[PDB]
């Protein structure tokens, strides 16, 4: 389903990384936030929703979504209810970037552009646009 | 051309809003930043580039792009060198949102989903995915 996203937080260097994965394609978007707050989550979802047609969202930590702030963002946007990899890539480019923030966006870029390999080879980034377009 | 973006900053309530416009489609992405810094611009471009195939970027204030930090982000991502409207929509939803940050993302959502009207009617959001997909 083209409207399904997965959203979780992961930790690195005492910082929090918000990671969204478009399930059908493997495409991700990430943000480094100070702390794991409901206000940060609602904001992130609002941004995601104004860019892709987000219908439902899943998470591995359900308590992530209980705040009224998050519920308010989902209601308004009309939303209903890679970490190892991303972390690896992030590990690989970490020295090239001065800040974790920058290493993370570099990792997202690398991951989304990586072609599945072979004749043609499509990346998660190509896959998401095709799936949404076709739909 | 599907790879062209326009990027500028605008001001509201003593805050700075970074606005990116995909020229061919009218699709926008925005971020509210504390100040108009080169580090903020490079970061924003890195995020944009890992999500869309960004080839060139234009701005109405060329000095915006002179920092080594911005030039470093463009080099790495391989990048070469609506305000009234957005501001209006933002004006319209401002009371509904507690913070400017939130009103801005609501405005972006509204603008990207607005269909051109008529039989079929496509929005900037639908247009960008089609243009990139087809390409």
């Amino acid at each position: 389903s083209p409207g399904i996203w997965q959203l979780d937080c992961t930790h690195l260097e005492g910082k929090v990384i918000l990671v969204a994965v478009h399930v059908a394609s493997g495409y991700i978007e990430a943000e480094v936030i100070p702390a794991e707050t409901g206000q940060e989550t609602a904001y992130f979802l609002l941004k995601l929703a104004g860019r892709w047609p987000v219908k439902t969202v899943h998470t591995d930590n359900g308590s992530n979504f209980t705040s009224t702030t998050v519920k308010a963002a989902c209601w308004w946007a009309g939303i209903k209810q890679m970490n190892k990899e991303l972390k690896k890539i992030i590990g690989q480019v970490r020295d090239q970037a001065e800040h974790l923030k920058t290493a993370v966006q570099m990792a997202v870029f690398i991951h989304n552009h990586k072609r599945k390999g072979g004749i043609g080879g499509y990346s998660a980034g190509e896959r998401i646009v095709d799936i949404i377009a076709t739909d």
Side-chain angles (χ1 to χ4, degrees), chain A residues 4-128:
Chain A
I4 307 154
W5 290 77
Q6 167 92 20
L7 177 49
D8 298 271
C9 282
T10 193
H11 307 255
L12 211 41
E13 313 180 5
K15 316 237 162 106
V16 177
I17 306 157
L18 210 15
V19 191
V21 188
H22 178 245
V23 187
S25 65
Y27 163 92
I28 93 261
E29 270 182 25
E31 209 76 48
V32 166
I33 53 168
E36 222 155 320
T37 74
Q39 297 181 179
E40 289 297 348
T41 294
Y43 184 66
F44 186 94
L45 286 161
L46 219 42
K47 307 210 270 182
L48 196 77
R51 147 191 321 135
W52 307 100
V54 183
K55 265 186 238 211
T56 66
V57 174
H58 181 72
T59 192
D60 271 358
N61 186 166
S63 71
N64 269 345
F65 293 170
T66 69
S67 63
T68 97
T69 303
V70 167
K71 280 163 163 173
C74 283
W75 162 80
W76 191 89
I79 299 160
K80 295 328 277 72
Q81 205 162 152
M82 326 275 253
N83 299 84
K84 248 56 159 270
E85 180 84 18
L86 177 70
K87 242 143 187 231
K88 179 197 15 204
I89 300 162
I90 288 173
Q92 310 179 320
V93 313
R94 189 59 176 94
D95 81 286
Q96 235 221 286
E98 271 59 68
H99 313 282
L100 174 67
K101 236 163 100 119
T102 309
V104 168
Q105 295 318 335
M106 281 163 78
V108 161
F109 179 113
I110 285 147
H111 162 94
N112 283 352
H113 293 9
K114 204 160 245 160
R115 275 153 197 221
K116 193 122 202 174
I119 305 301
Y122 312 73
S123 54
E126 272 158 350
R127 270 208 295 295
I128 183 166

